Amino acid sequence: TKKVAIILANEFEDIEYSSPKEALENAGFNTVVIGDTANSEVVGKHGEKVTVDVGIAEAKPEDYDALLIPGGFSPDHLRGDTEGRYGTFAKYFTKNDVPTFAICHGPQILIDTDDLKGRTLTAVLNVRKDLSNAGAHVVDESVVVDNNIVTSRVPDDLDDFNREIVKQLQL
Template sequence: MTKPVAIILANDFEDIELTSPKEAIEEAGYKTVIIGHEAGEEVVGKHGTKAKVGVGIGSAEPSEYSALFIPGGFSPDHLRGDVDGRYGTFAKAFMKDNKPVFAICHGPQVLIDTDDLKGRTLTAVLNVRKDLSNAGAHVKDESVVVDGNLVTSRTPDDLNDFNHAIVELLNKDYK
């Protein structure tokens, strides 16, 4: 059985940037697990979508997941505000182990905390591209950028390309 895809999430996520890729991942045959501050907690998107945290970050083990998905909105900023840096540490394990990492819009912000962006190529929403560049990444203005195990995208307008790239990578390496 394939391990589930971890989704790290906090309040104020961009609703469609969670629901559309999550649906594509699940339609491709993968289970998803939302990881947040506390198991059982309900997080709410910018437009009212509710999601239940299945696993608290304090007990989340990267080895139990096949891939990591980071939706955008303001959620990544909240995740980066974790005083113990647990979300950056969690994401770093996926980067280190060369597991697939999918991030859209503001999602790549979390990857800055991995210290693993130097020389990587990615994209994001305009207002975080400079931060990514300062972290050593090569940043492009494209709907989706695939750099090995890392798939990034800009905005909800790019979801079709992003979802396609996610499923393609999962089916290529993890079925």
């Protein structure tokens, strides 16, 4: 059975957690929330409460078949980790070509892998310049697939995003 790590801090955009989670689960995959502390609670921009399953210190990235990075201000919070642990975690996925799904601000964490040069991604407008400065080829499309990396921009893109992330796990 295949399972997806979702990295999550406070002030995630609620629907960018719940909608991809539901799409993945509907296709028969399971999801695990990775955050600062196991059994702590993180709260979305619009109040959705999510319990963290596994702490970032304990998580083994090789256990997971894909990584999902919801947007909102959750990725900016994750990037405040003093030891940079979420960028390091994400680096397993980009280095080993494991399916990697990020929507809106989500691709901010991918900058911290240093693995973006020459990769093709989209994101929310707010972060596109930072992605381009990280070396990516940045485009403006509802969903972009570059081998293992699937990116989208905004919550309106979720239907396209959810279709592609599920396909990529079927491989």
